[PDB]
Design an enzyme around this catalytic site. Structure first.
Site, PDB file in Angstrom:
ATOM      1  N   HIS A   1       9.131  -3.205  46.364  1.00 50.74           N
ATOM      2  CA  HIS A   1       8.509  -2.084  45.668  1.00 50.74           C
ATOM      3  C   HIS A   1       8.171  -2.442  44.221  1.00 50.74           C
ATOM      4  CE1 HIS A   1       8.984   1.473  48.427  1.00 50.74           C
ATOM      5  NE2 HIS A   1       9.775   0.608  49.034  1.00 50.74           N
TER       6      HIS A   1
ATOM      7  N   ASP B   1       6.830   5.449  41.599  1.00 51.06           N
ATOM      8  CA  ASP B   1       6.882   5.209  43.030  1.00 51.06           C
ATOM      9  C   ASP B   1       7.189   6.547  43.691  1.00 51.06           C
ATOM     10  OD1 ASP B   1       7.622   2.616  45.095  1.00 51.06           O
ATOM     11  OD2 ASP B   1       8.348   4.605  45.668  1.00 51.06           O
TER      12      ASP B   1
HETATM   13  O1  DLM Z   1      11.000   5.611  57.007  1.00 47.93           O
HETATM   14  C1  DLM Z   1      10.673   4.727  56.022  1.00 47.93           C
HETATM   15  C2  DLM Z   1       9.351   4.662  55.581  1.00 47.93           C
HETATM   16  C3  DLM Z   1       8.970   3.778  54.577  1.00 47.93           C
HETATM   17  O2  DLM Z   1       7.676   3.726  54.155  1.00 47.93           O
HETATM   18  C4  DLM Z   1      10.003   2.892  53.974  1.00 47.93           C
HETATM   19  C5  DLM Z   1       9.696   1.986  52.969  1.00 47.93           C
HETATM   20  C6  DLM Z   1      10.699   1.180  52.438  1.00 47.93           C
HETATM   21  O3  DLM Z   1      10.360   0.300  51.455  1.00 47.93           O
HETATM   22  C7  DLM Z   1      12.100   1.299  52.960  1.00 47.93           C
HETATM   23  C8  DLM Z   1      13.251   0.485  52.463  1.00 47.93           C
HETATM   24  C9  DLM Z   1      13.166  -0.328  51.330  1.00 47.93           C
HETATM   25  C10 DLM Z   1      14.253  -1.078  50.883  1.00 47.93           C
HETATM   26  O4  DLM Z   1      14.145  -1.866  49.778  1.00 47.93           O
HETATM   27  C11 DLM Z   1      15.533  -1.003  51.627  1.00 47.93           C
HETATM   28  O5  DLM Z   1      16.629  -1.713  51.235  1.00 47.93           O
HETATM   29  C12 DLM Z   1      15.581  -0.129  52.822  1.00 47.93           C
HETATM   30  O6  DLM Z   1      16.727  -0.015  53.551  1.00 47.93           O
HETATM   31  C13 DLM Z   1      14.440   0.578  53.184  1.00 47.93           C
HETATM   32  O7  DLM Z   1      12.378   2.202  53.956  1.00 47.93           O
HETATM   33  C14 DLM Z   1      11.394   2.997  54.477  1.00 47.93           C
HETATM   34  C15 DLM Z   1      11.673   3.915  55.482  1.00 47.93           C
END
Ligand code: DLM
Length: 446
Positions: A17, A114
């Site tokens: 992100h 974000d």
């Molecule tokens: O249902 C969703 C829809 C999305 O768009 C998502 C996008 C994401 O970046 C993450 C995400 C990011 C991380 O850095 C983590 O450690 C993690 O466990 C999950 O989860 C998501 C779950």
């Protein structure tokens, strides 16, 4: 008249992100060097982005709490740290605003955040400044959050391969593609999932929603659906600013190796850095790569080398490369690579489609199922691996389909078509060029 424009930036302070939001701020800072940009991250997120990297002087970095008290040791699950940061609430975020205001001597006029940092909206409303949501995830997944009740109802009553035709432009999406934490109710609900399930109410309050993708690749009907839910939908080209790129030594020699391979012959395998795949699938990937006889580059965590079959790396050493790290963007832009075997992370799919590389898809969580479904059934630039999981026989078939067989010509052709679409999308006057200026105007009018 003194320029007093001050944009506060709130990233989701974790891994994938962080770069796309820095990439956006850099572009904004280059075109508005008279404006102050306050990037507000955690100690670990700031170290990740800014350790050895030169940033423009109108971007200043400030540190807030990660929500992890000294002494605590988070478990080995990728959700806890997210929940802990989100638990800090708007008060921790306002401490970053304090540090920004004290330094710049300027009150914040605008906030870019974000979309996951939903607390930053309360912050924006308290300061009475526009709130701009940034979306680095799968774009088509934006529609889901406005139909949670419809989706939860269908996922429990209908079949798993039932279509979600109530989503304009996304009738190919199925029940089995829906993110699990969107369906989880009660004890399984996390602060993270509750935050994501608030997007349908949160996002319409944003002055603008900036999508890190190419508008020309999304289904036009989905785009019109989102424009009907939001105050403004803006697409900014996800491609890196040259200010973002940190050139480093290809320690593994992937590119030099790829130069000795023929066009569209190499399989590039990578499951990301958040994903912990079952050891049996890991065994299956090695088994499939070895049996297939195709040249391959597999970016694999060294903690998983002990899981690999005995003698596999040694037997495949003449035609395969197993490494801890690859310059993925440079690898995907290499002509020798014929297929991207991926977990379908938004950034990896972005890099693969902009380089005309077809994909074998094995989504693990989140919106990777949405990405995989779009890749196979809409763009048709790849396939979901046979059986939804990695097996030796299923993966070899996918590898043979994409790389050599005439049955995969339609997919290889579509990958080239999509690449050309992207190349015209990033042009001097695609939609994003117009949308980038709109965003700049929002910031200068704030
Ligand atoms: O249902 C969703 C829809 C999305 O768009 C998502 C996008 C994401 O970046 C993450 C995400 C990011 C991380 O850095 C983590 O450690 C993690 O466990 C999950 O989860 C998501 C779950």
């Amino acid at each position: 008249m003194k320029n007093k424009q001050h944009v506060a930036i709130f990233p989701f302070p974790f891994g994938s992100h962080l770069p796309p939001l820095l990439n956006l701020v850099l572009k904004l800072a280059h075109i508005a060097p008279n404006t102050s940009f306050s990037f507000i991250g955690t100690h670990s997120s700031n170290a990740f982005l800014f350790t050895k990297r030169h940033i423009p002087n109108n971007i200043r970095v400030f540190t807030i709490s990660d929500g992890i008290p000294e002494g605590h040791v988070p478990a080995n699950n990728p959700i806890e740290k997210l929940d802990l940061f989100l638990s800090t609430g708007p008060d921790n975020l306002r401490k970053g605003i304090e540090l920004a205001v004290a330094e710049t001597k300027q009150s914040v006029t605008c906030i870019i955040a974000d979309a996951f940092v939903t607390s930053s909206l309360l912050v924006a409303q308290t300061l009475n400044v526009p709130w701009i949501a940034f979306w680095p995830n799968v774009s088509c997944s934006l529609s889901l959050y406005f139909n949670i009740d419809l989706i939860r109802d269908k996922c429990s009553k209908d079949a798993k391969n039932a279509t979600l035709d109530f989503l304009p432009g996304l009738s190919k999406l199925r029940v089995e593609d829906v993110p699990q934490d969107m369906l989880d109710v009660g004890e399984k609900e996390t602060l993270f999932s509750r935050t994501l399930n608030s997007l349908g109410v949160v996002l319409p309050q944003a002055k603008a929603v900036v999508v890190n993708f190419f508008a020309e690749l999304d289904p036009p009907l989905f785009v019109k659906y989102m424009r009907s839910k939001l105050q403004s939908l803006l697409y900014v080209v996800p491609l890196p600013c040259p200010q973002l790129l940190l050139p480093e030594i290809d320690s593994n020699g992937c590119l030099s190796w790829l130069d000795s391979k023929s066009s569209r012959s190499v399989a590039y395998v990578c499951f990301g850095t958040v994903v912990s795949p079952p050891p049996q699938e890991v065994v299956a990937v090695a088994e499939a790569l070895e049996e297939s006889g195709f040249p391959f580059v597999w970016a694999l965590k060294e903690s998983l080398l002990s899981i690999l079959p005995k003698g596999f790396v040694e037997r495949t050493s003449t035609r395969g490369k197993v490494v801890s790290w690859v310059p993925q963007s440079h690898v995907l832009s290499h002509g020798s690579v014929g297929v991207f075997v991926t977990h379908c992370g938004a950034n990896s799919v972005m890099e693969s489609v902009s380089n005309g590389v077809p994909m074998i898809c094995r989504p693990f969580f989140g919106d990777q199922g949405i990405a995989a479904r779009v890749i196979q059934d809409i763009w048709e630039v790849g396939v979901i691996v046979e059986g939804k999981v990695f097996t030796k026989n299923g993966f070899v078939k996918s590898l043979n389909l994409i790389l050599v067989q005439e049955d995969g010509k339609k997919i290889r052709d579509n990958a080239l078509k999509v690449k050309q679409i992207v190349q015209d999308a990033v042009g001097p006057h695609g939609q994003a060029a117009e949308d980038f200026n709109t965003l700049v105007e929002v910031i200068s009018s704030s």
